Design a protein around this motif. Sequence first.
Motif, PDB file in Angstrom:
ATOM      1  N   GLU A  89      71.579  51.552  89.359  1.00  0.00           N
ATOM      2  CA  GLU A  89      70.577  52.255  88.561  1.00  0.00           C
ATOM      3  C   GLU A  89      70.877  53.756  88.567  1.00  0.00           C
ATOM      4  OE1 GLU A  89      66.293  51.552  89.102  1.00  0.00           O
ATOM      5  OE2 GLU A  89      66.612  49.410  88.701  1.00  0.00           O
ATOM      6  N   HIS A 118      71.044  52.087  77.893  1.00  0.00           N
ATOM      7  CA  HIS A 118      69.590  52.186  77.923  1.00  0.00           C
ATOM      8  C   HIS A 118      69.020  51.182  76.925  1.00  0.00           C
ATOM      9  CE1 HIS A 118      65.630  53.711  78.844  1.00  0.00           C
ATOM     10  NE2 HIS A 118      65.364  53.490  77.559  1.00  0.00           N
ATOM     11  N   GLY A 119      68.455  50.107  77.457  1.00  0.00           N
ATOM     12  CA  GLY A 119      67.838  49.054  76.668  1.00  0.00           C
ATOM     13  C   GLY A 119      66.347  49.271  76.540  1.00  0.00           C
ATOM     14  N   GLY A 140      54.540  52.205  89.143  1.00  0.00           N
ATOM     15  CA  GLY A 140      55.460  51.436  88.307  1.00  0.00           C
ATOM     16  C   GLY A 140      56.932  51.808  88.304  1.00  0.00           C
ATOM     17  N   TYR A 141      57.278  53.024  88.782  1.00  0.00           N
ATOM     18  CA  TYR A 141      58.656  53.537  88.789  1.00  0.00           C
ATOM     19  C   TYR A 141      59.228  53.492  90.201  1.00  0.00           C
ATOM     20  CZ  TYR A 141      56.461  55.250  84.512  1.00  0.00           C
ATOM     21  OH  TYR A 141      55.732  55.320  83.347  1.00  0.00           O
ATOM     22  N   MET A 142      60.398  52.834  90.366  1.00  0.00           N
ATOM     23  CA  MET A 142      61.055  52.647  91.664  1.00  0.00           C
ATOM     24  C   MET A 142      61.553  53.968  92.253  1.00  0.00           C
ATOM     25  SD  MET A 142      64.018  49.910  92.750  1.00  0.00           S
ATOM     26  CE  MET A 142      62.941  48.485  92.866  1.00  0.00           C
ATOM     27  N   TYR A 194      65.527  44.374  79.064  1.00  0.00           N
ATOM     28  CA  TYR A 194      64.475  45.301  78.648  1.00  0.00           C
ATOM     29  C   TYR A 194      64.302  45.328  77.118  1.00  0.00           C
ATOM     30  CZ  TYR A 194      64.098  47.024  83.445  1.00  0.00           C
ATOM     31  OH  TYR A 194      63.874  47.111  84.795  1.00  0.00           O
ATOM     32  N   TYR A 203      65.840  56.163  83.099  1.00  0.00           N
ATOM     33  CA  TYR A 203      66.584  55.099  83.782  1.00  0.00           C
ATOM     34  C   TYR A 203      67.744  54.532  82.940  1.00  0.00           C
ATOM     35  CZ  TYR A 203      63.097  54.878  87.569  1.00  0.00           C
ATOM     36  OH  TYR A 203      62.284  55.166  88.632  1.00  0.00           O
ATOM     37  N   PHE A 204      68.904  54.297  83.591  1.00  0.00           N
ATOM     38  CA  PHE A 204      70.137  53.766  82.998  1.00  0.00           C
ATOM     39  C   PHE A 204      70.825  52.760  83.913  1.00  0.00           C
ATOM     40  CE2 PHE A 204      69.902  58.005  80.884  1.00  0.00           C
ATOM     41  CZ  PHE A 204      70.129  57.668  79.566  1.00  0.00           C
ATOM     42  N   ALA A 205      71.768  51.975  83.359  1.00  0.00           N
ATOM     43  CA  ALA A 205      72.544  50.988  84.110  1.00  0.00           C
ATOM     44  C   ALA A 205      73.971  50.908  83.584  1.00  0.00           C
ATOM     45  CB  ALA A 205      71.877  49.621  84.038  1.00  0.00           C
ATOM     46  N   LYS A 249      71.639  44.077  82.461  1.00  0.00           N
ATOM     47  CA  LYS A 249      70.472  44.697  83.091  1.00  0.00           C
ATOM     48  C   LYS A 249      69.562  45.311  82.023  1.00  0.00           C
ATOM     49  CE  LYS A 249      69.219  47.345  87.164  1.00  0.00           C
ATOM     50  NZ  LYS A 249      69.710  47.622  88.536  1.00  0.00           N
ATOM     51  N   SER A 250      70.117  46.203  81.182  1.00  0.00           N
ATOM     52  CA  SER A 250      69.409  46.869  80.089  1.00  0.00           C
ATOM     53  C   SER A 250      68.993  45.881  78.987  1.00  0.00           C
ATOM     54  CB  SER A 250      70.274  47.974  79.495  1.00  0.00           C
ATOM     55  OG  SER A 250      70.513  49.005  80.438  1.00  0.00           O
ATOM     56  N   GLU A 253      53.283  49.800  81.243  1.00  0.00           N
ATOM     57  CA  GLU A 253      54.382  49.431  80.336  1.00  0.00           C
ATOM     58  C   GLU A 253      53.865  49.255  78.903  1.00  0.00           C
ATOM     59  OE1 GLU A 253      56.093  46.203  83.040  1.00  0.00           O
ATOM     60  OE2 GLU A 253      57.947  46.899  82.073  1.00  0.00           O
TER      61      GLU A 253
HETATM   62  C1  LIG Z   1      60.611  51.711  86.124  1.00  0.00           C
HETATM   63  N1  LIG Z   1      60.103  50.649  85.269  1.00  0.00           N
HETATM   64  C2  LIG Z   1      60.736  49.335  85.327  1.00  0.00           C
HETATM   65  C3  LIG Z   1      58.977  50.898  84.369  1.00  0.00           C
HETATM   66  C4  LIG Z   1      59.425  51.023  82.922  1.00  0.00           C
HETATM   67  O1  LIG Z   1      58.790  50.484  82.025  1.00  0.00           O
HETATM   68  N2  LIG Z   1      60.505  51.779  82.701  1.00  0.00           N
HETATM   69  C5  LIG Z   1      61.643  51.378  82.075  1.00  0.00           C
HETATM   70  C6  LIG Z   1      61.698  51.378  80.669  1.00  0.00           C
HETATM   71  C7  LIG Z   1      62.881  51.100  79.972  1.00  0.00           C
HETATM   72  C8  LIG Z   1      64.053  50.860  80.690  1.00  0.00           C
HETATM   73  N3  LIG Z   1      65.203  50.622  80.038  1.00  0.00           N
HETATM   74  C9  LIG Z   1      66.366  50.384  80.677  1.00  0.00           C
HETATM   75  O2  LIG Z   1      67.394  50.160  80.004  1.00  0.00           O
HETATM   76  C10 LIG Z   1      66.450  50.391  82.173  1.00  0.00           C
HETATM   77  C11 LIG Z   1      67.668  50.138  82.815  1.00  0.00           C
HETATM   78  C12 LIG Z   1      67.729  50.142  84.209  1.00  0.00           C
HETATM   79  C13 LIG Z   1      66.579  50.391  84.961  1.00  0.00           C
HETATM   80  C14 LIG Z   1      65.355  50.603  84.323  1.00  0.00           C
HETATM   81  C15 LIG Z   1      65.294  50.636  82.926  1.00  0.00           C
HETATM   82  C16 LIG Z   1      64.019  50.906  82.188  1.00  0.00           C
HETATM   83  C17 LIG Z   1      62.809  51.197  82.830  1.00  0.00           C
END
Ligand SMILES: CN(C)CC(=O)Nc1ccc2[nH]c(=O)c3ccccc3c2c1
Length: 323
Positions: free
Chosen positions: A301, A182-183, A208-210, A227, A216-218, A223-224, A94
């Motif tokens: 997600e 996207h945060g 690190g990635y699920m 971040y 990635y979006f929400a 949630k965002s 990260e």
């Molecule tokens: C998958 N990870 C948590 C590692 C990472 O740093 N990636 C990351 C990096 C930025 C991210 N920004 C988001 O808005 C988001 C929203 C929903 C799910 C994940 C994210 C998001 C994920």
Amino acid sequence: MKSKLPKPVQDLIKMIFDVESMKKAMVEYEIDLQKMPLGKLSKRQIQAAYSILSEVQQAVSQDSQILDLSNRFYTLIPHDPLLNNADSVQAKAEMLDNLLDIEVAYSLLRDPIDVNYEKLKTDIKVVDRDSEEAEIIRKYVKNTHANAYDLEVIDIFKIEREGECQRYKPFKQLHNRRLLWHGSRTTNFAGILSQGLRIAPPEAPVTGYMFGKGIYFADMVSKSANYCHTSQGDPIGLILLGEVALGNMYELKHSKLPKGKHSVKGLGKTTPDPSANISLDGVDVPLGTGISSDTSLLYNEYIVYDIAQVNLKYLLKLKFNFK
Ligand SMILES: CN(C)CC(=O)Nc1ccc2[nH]c(=O)c3ccccc3c2c1
């Protein structure tokens, strides 16, 4: 000479290009700014640190052997912590994901405000508070919020990324096009506007990635918003809104996309009310209040594995309240 750009835009350029915010983040990331300053930061060593970080991830097959390469990472990145755990690799993953967007920011950086706006290569127009789209955007914040902090929109910007529309063109024919959040950290945004929203490199570790490496979006703003990495000191943060051509969704509770699918939907516990869903410009906007959907997730997600499937439409300057 006196810039003709509006004050919310002028102040945003100052915010996304803040040199002190970059050095501040380097101090918080424990990086020794004396042995490696902000300037002497290079992409060639960030990418090298990744390929060493994935080798620690390779130490799944086999402690004296791990620390021989674990410290070799601290040789490339000075610190002022043993890397053997999966959590230790994700933490530095990260960090490098953030450091690269700072190297990009300072590369572009090295009247003056007008040159920086044009350096980003993006059209940033202020959205009026009285406009229909402002109500739809404000309702999306107020209704899709989960309660440890409160959110209030300071500014709304219609961002037109250069060369993104012609890139998004083939995916516009896909069904199920949704407007999602996207945060990201306030420092990364200088790179997000020039390079755009990207996917992690093959050098980076997959742990690190699920749902693997993608974008990635929400649907839930909260949630965002987590971040954004906003604190009591500096509560102002930036969150995006982008048109995501999801189409054929691969619904997952817990390889690579089956021949026929175009996106992945990590199902959550709470989903915004579907009976309160507005289809603005033929793009679904789930601005309903959170209702319940076995699921191993917080909320929904949305992950796309092609950079072109995304079309960044809006930008929000948010204020965080701490109770
Ligand atoms: C998958 N990870 C948590 C590692 C990472 O740093 N990636 C990351 C990096 C930025 C991210 N920004 C988001 O808005 C988001 C929203 C929903 C799910 C994940 C994210 C998001 C994920």
